[PDB]
Design a protein around this ligand. Structure first.
Ligand code: HEM
Ligand code: NAG
Ligand code: NAG
Ligand code: NAG
Ligand code: NAG
Ligand code: NAG
Ligand code: C14
Ligand code: CL
Ligand code: MG
Length: 325
C-alpha cells in the first residue's frame, strides 16, 4: 500500500490503553533487535507475532510513539528492502521466518531485522555484536552498563549526555573485541540516531524532558512493555539531539580489518558530511547486491519500495534508479 501520512492529531495521549494491553509472547511470536517495534508488537499496535507490512509499521511507530513520518518512512522502507519480502509485502521484526512467504532467489536473504549487516549492526547499546553469537536478544550485562553510564553522566537517568558517552564506549568495546567490527554507511548513521530514541520517545510525553528513568528503560529494552499509564511524546520526532551524541566523541566511519584493535577509516564510506551518499550507496550497493538481476514482478516491487524509500530522504538529495525508471 502507499506509505501512511503523518498523524492528523499528534498530541500526547495514553498509548498503554485498554485496546493496546501488554501481553507475553506465545510460541512462534517474533521479537528482534529494536525495542520500539518489539514494544509495539507486544501492545498490539503491530501484529503480536512480529510479522507486519511496511504500512502497519509506519502507522504503529506514529500512533504508539509519535515517531515522525519522514523518519518512519525512511527506516521502514530501508528495512523492508533489505530484510522484508517485497512480493508478499511482509517483514519480520526479528528472525527469518517462513511467515513472510516464498523467498526470492539468492543472493536475497529476507532475513528479518535480525539479519546482520543489512540494517542491524555492531555497537548496539543493549544487544551484542553478531560476532559474539546473538545480535537481537536483550543482554543484561550491556543493560547494566547503560545503567552505570546513566548513573555517571545522567544523574541516574538516560539522556543525550549519557547517549554521547555510551555510544562511544560501545564503539571502543567493539574495536577492542570484535575483529569483524563494521561501522560504515547505513550503520554509522543509524547507530547515532538510535541512541537518541530512548530520550526522545521512551520518556512519558507529559514530561518530554529527555530524562529516561531506568525502570521505564528496562520495561522497554527487556520486556517490550510500556510503563503503566505511558503517554506518547507530545509531538512528532525521531533523532533530534543526535548532534549532541556526535559532538561528545566525533568518529570517522571504518572497520576492524579482521583483527581486534585495527580500526581502519573507509574513505569510500558516507559520513554526516555526505548524507545523500549514504542513500545512494544503500540503493546502488546494498539493495542492488541482494537483487542484482530481478525478474519482472520483483523489479516492479523493488522500484515501488525504492520510490517509497525516497519519500523519506531529506530534501536536496537526487533519487537514484538502479533498475531504471
Ligand atoms: C520506524 C521503523 C523502525 C525500524 C525499521 C527500526 C529498526 C531497528 C533495527 C533493525 C534496530 C537494530 C539496530 C542495531 O542496534 O543493531 C533498531 C534499534 C533501535 N531502535 Fe528501532 N526501528 C524503528 C523505529 C524505532 C522506534 C519508533 C523506536 C523507539 C520508540 C526505536 C528504538 C530503537 C532503539 C532504542 C534501538 C537501539 C537498541 C540498542 O542499541 O540496544 N526504533 N531499530
Ligand atoms: C487530539 O487528541 C488530544 C488528546 O487525545 C485531544 O485532547 C485533542 O482535543 C484532540 N484534537 C482534536 C483533533 O480533537
Ligand atoms: C563480518 O563482516 C561482514 C561485512 O564486513 C559481514 O558480511 C559478516 O556478516 C560479518 N559477520 C559477523 C558475524 O560479524
Ligand atoms: C551479554 O554481553 C556480555 C558482554 O559483552 C557478553 O559477555 C555475554 O556473553 C552476552 N550474553 C549474555 C547471554 O549475557
Ligand atoms: C543529563 O543529566 C545530567 C544530570 O542531571 C546533566 O548534568 C546533563 O545536563 C543532562 N543532559 C541532558 C542532555 O539533559
Ligand atoms: C548510483 O547509481 C546512479 C546511476 O543509476 C549514479 O548516478 C550514482 O552516481 C550512483 N551513486 C553511487 C554513490 O554509486
Ligand atoms: C538515518 C537515520 C536518522 C534518524 C531518523 C531521522 C531522519 C529522517 C530520515 C531522513 C534520512 C535522510 C538521508 C539522506
Ligand atoms: Cl510526522
Ligand atoms: Mg546491533
Amino acid at each position: 500500500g502507499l506509505p501512511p501520512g503523518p498523524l492528523e492529531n499528534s498530541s500526547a495521549k495514553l498509548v498503554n490503553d485498554e485496546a493496546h494491553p501488554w501481553k507475553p509472547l506465545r510460541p512462534g511470536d517474533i521479537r528482534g533487535p529494536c525495542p520500539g517495534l518489539n514494544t509495539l508488537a507486544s501492545h498490539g499496535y503491530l501484529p503480536r507475532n512480529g510479522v507486519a507490512t511496511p504500512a502497519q509499521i509506519i502507522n504503529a511507530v506514529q500512533e504508539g510513539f509519535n515517531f515522525d513520518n519522514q523518519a518512519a518512512i525512511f527506516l521502514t522502507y530501508a528495512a523492508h528492502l533489505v530484510d522484508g519480502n517485497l512480493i508478499t509485502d511482509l517483514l519480520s521484526i526479528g528472525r527469518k521466518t517462513r511467515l513472510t512467504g516464498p523467498d526470492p532467489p539468492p543472493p536475497a536473504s529476507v532475513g528479518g531485522l535480525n539479519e546482520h549487516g543489512t540494517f542491524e549492526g555492531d555497537a548496539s547499546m543493549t544487544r551484542g555484536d553478531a560476532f559474539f553469537g546473538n545480535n537481537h536478544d536483550f543482554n543484561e550485562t550491556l543493560f547494566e552498563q547503560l545503567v552505570d553510564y546513566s548513573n555517571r553522566f545522567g544523574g541516574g537517568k538516560y539522556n543525550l549526555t549519557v547517549a554521547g558517552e555510551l555510544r562511544f564506549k560501545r564503539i571502543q568495546d567493539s574495536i577492542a573485541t570484535n575483529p569483524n567490527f563494521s561501522f560504515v554507511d547505513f550503520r554509522f548513521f543509524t547507530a547515532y540516531g538510535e541512541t537518541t530514541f530512548p530520550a526522545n520517545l521512551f520518556v512519558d510525553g507529559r514530561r518530554d524532558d529527555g530524562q529516561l528513568d531506568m525502570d521505564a528503560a528496562r520495561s522497554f529494552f527487556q520486556f517490550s512493555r510500556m510503563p503503566d499509564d505511558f503517554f506518547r511524546a507530545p509531538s512528532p520526532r525521531s533523532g533530534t539531539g543526535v548532534e549532541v551524541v556526535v559532538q561528545a566523541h566525533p568518529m570517522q566511519p571504518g572497520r576492524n580489518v579482521g583483527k581486534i584493535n585495527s580500526y581502519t577509516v573507509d574513505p569510500t564510506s558516507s559520513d554526516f558530511s555526505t548524507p545523500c551518499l549514504m542513500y545512494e550507496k544503500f540503493v546502488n550497493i546494498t539493495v542492488k547486491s541482494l537483487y542484482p538481476n530481478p525478474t519482472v514482478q520483483l523489479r516492479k516491487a523493488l522500484n515501488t519500495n525504492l520510490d517509497f524509500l525516497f519519500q523519506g530522504v531529506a530534501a536536496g538529495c537526487t533519487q537514484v534508479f538502479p533498475y531504471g525508471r
